[PDB]
């Protein structure tokens, strides 16, 4: 329900004819949700344009999987390529969206997620060069860790990049980071402005439409 | 004469090499060839790959058996024992942003000096590398990462040793091709010249120098 | 829809535009939108391309016309039209390395600042460049190469703007696509959708925004 | 006959399997004096490995062509490209020998082979790259410029490359760049040492193996 109130909400952001690409995890859930009407192209960094949803039993290709390597199937159309071609995509701006998953979100809009000192050190991927990248970049994470929150003044673990990603989307909030600071623009309607402002460390300018839907 | 045994990695692959290994988390990876480095323990290597895959799978087979002095990689999450060895010292962790390694392979490839990537800028990857400014922008000078072999996984091979991928297996196989000094593909099939196409062809086979199987 | 008419040049194209055109020596030139553009005296142009061709030929037309301010080529020597306005002065005429043409002309379309080459160094192409050291190695900082549209040609595509390129038709044509604005691909062949396989497309069709014939 | 001689010299440089990128004019005639029990591989810097001869009447693809734009054929096996490829191969070592044309060589390797100031100003193609990136470049040219020494103590037209050349062939000398200098490893039988000397500007050491033969 958290996770799928965020989904939810990002898959109203794309639009006909993006190229959108999916973070692991919470991110790919958006694309249960994309409204007929739209249709979108899905990028995985390893080196598809065209991914599709997971094949029926029987249906798996081991050349053919997502960054996670799990089995996913191949749209008409689909073009595969090598991994300077698919960067090539990402930095070079070709990229309409991407959804990424969240550690920390700060003021100036910059994102942390690829790394926790002590804890979990995996690398970071291709995320930087996501974010460096594409048009628009939309995290999708949920409020706060454990009620500590994510949102905050200056990110304390370290950077993805220093771009400010274009929005932030919680199970509680839509915020649109901007050039004076973050604009909160959504509230959930299973919450209210007090709760959001005490699960939010960062500054928050408010908007005079403030609507609601997650 | 490209296609030999793969008893002859032990005359191509040497102690402490450096070695660029084709492989997004195993999809396109030459397993057999690894397996044969495990068997005769060929050691100290240094491995350029996207990752380390899974404990059991591609790479990871190669850290689980301790023959890795340091890996230049974008990833290691997906392999705990990557991760255990990192933390104890043994293993030298070199990280590096999925798209800049692919940059900084290919600039070896194509005979650049080194390639001004916005990637990392700002970060801890800017630790340690010159910055550039062009045109009121920063710029990470990132710079030509070199193998004594490629070890790369395809498809086919015509009899001139001409290459095609399949999928998402090809992600960074043609580009370490270009880059090693010498080049051994693992591939699944022989096919006639003839059978792949000038248009269709990835990887010349002037530039492969063995194929196992 | 991508596919449009050919009239809808004069639209898309405009007076001093910087335009990408593919081909070499005419070969894998889009002849037609070519045609077009001379047909309605668009000008002032800035054209970026391997070369002039020649006077009765591809981009050598559009010098003929004189419906170019600069061109920045690696080649002029088959088209004394060009040659004569350059020595004349009215054209001015920027030369650049083959190599480091498709090299700044790729920068761009792959998002890096700049990349190092070799190529030039000690000789005339040196002159205001930045010079880089990398292992007591000159190289050139070479800067990316961008345009307001790309004039590319191809063999096919298919319905939804996937493109393959035909022999030594390529060249330029895939990586100009990647670095313009706004791409515009002349093709042969319109084909459905499942004819390109993903192993052979060169140009996913989400970097084409109009295709005309 | 200097021009066949030597192109028939230089084709004797060549090894089996090689990929051999000529230039056009003097250099093509390489190919037709290759042995015929030496095979190599013809790339074009437009965009082709497995050049072949030009085609039979009829047989003509309007895009299959050499760096002339002339029609050629592709052998089986031939692999086509895009122009950074193509230039990868070249500039990154994987080209084994190029053979081009020389309007002066001096005896620091260096040669000088795209422009005359005051008549040709044709641009320098790909010249630049393959002098700099061929693992050996062979200069096959006219010993002297109606008498005039091409092969000289420094040059005075514009450098294609600071790169040390390899062989020079002419027709009366075969001249290996060296970092002593220019050593003279043979000449023709047509003509004499002296004379060879002569009609050289630079200071050559003459070797003591000192051979006959082009």
């Known amino acids: 329900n958290p996770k799928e109130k965020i989904a939810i909400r990002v898959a109203q952001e794309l639009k006909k004819g993006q190229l959108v690409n999916l973070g692991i995890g919470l991110p790919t859930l958006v694309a249960n949700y994309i409204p007929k009407d739209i249709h979108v192209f899905f990028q995985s960094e390893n080196g598809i344009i065209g991914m599709g949803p997971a094949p029926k039993e029987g249906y798996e290709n081991s050349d053919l999987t997502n960054a996670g390597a799990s089995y996913i199937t191949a749209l008409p159309g689909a073009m595969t390529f090598d991994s300077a071609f698919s960067f090539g995509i990402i930095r070079g701006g070709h990229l309409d969206v991407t959804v990424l998953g969240g550690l920390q979100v700060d003021e100036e809009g910059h994102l942390a997620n690829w790394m926790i000192p002590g804890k979990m050190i995996p690398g970071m991927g291709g995320a930087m060069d996501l974010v460096t990248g594409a048009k628009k970049v939309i995290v999708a994470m949920t409020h706060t860790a454990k009620g500590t929150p994510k949102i905050v003044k200056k990110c304390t673990l370290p950077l993805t990049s220093i771009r400010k990603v274009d929005l932030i989307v919680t199970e509680l909030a839509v915020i649109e980071p901007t050039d004076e600071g973050l604009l909160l623009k959504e509230i959930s309607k299973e919450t209210t402005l007090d709760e959001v402002l005490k699960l939010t460390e960062a500054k928050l300018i408010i908007a005079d439409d403030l609507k609601i839907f997650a | ?213």
């Open chain 2, 1 to 213: 004469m490209k296609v030999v045994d793969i008893s002859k990695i032990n005359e191509l692959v040497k102690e402490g090499a450096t070695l660029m290994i084709g492989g997004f988390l195993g999809v396109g990876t030459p397993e057999n060839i690894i397996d044969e480095i495990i068997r005769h323990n060929i050691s100290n290597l240094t491995v350029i790959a996207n990752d380390t895959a899974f404990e059991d799978r591609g790479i990871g087979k190669l850290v689980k058996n301790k023959l890795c002095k340091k890996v230049i990689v974008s990833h290691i999450g997906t392999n705990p024992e990557t991760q255990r060895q990192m933390i104890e010292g043994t293993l030298e962790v070199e990280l590096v942003p999925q798209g800049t390694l692919a940059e900084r392979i290919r600039a070896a490839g194509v005979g650049l000096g080194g390639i001004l990537t916005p990637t990392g800028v700002g970060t801890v990857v800017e630790k340690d590398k010159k910055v550039i400014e062009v045109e009121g922008k920063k710029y990470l000078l990132e710079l030509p990462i070199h193998a004594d072999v490629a070890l790369i996984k395809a498809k086919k091979a015509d009899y001139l040793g001409n290459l095609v991928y399949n999928l998402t297996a090809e992600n960074f196989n043609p580009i370490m091709a270009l880059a090693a000094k010498t080049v051994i593909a693992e591939v699944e099939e022989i096919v006639p010249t003839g059978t792949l196409s000038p248009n269709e062809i990835k990887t010349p086979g002037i530039i492969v120098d063995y194929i196992v199987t």
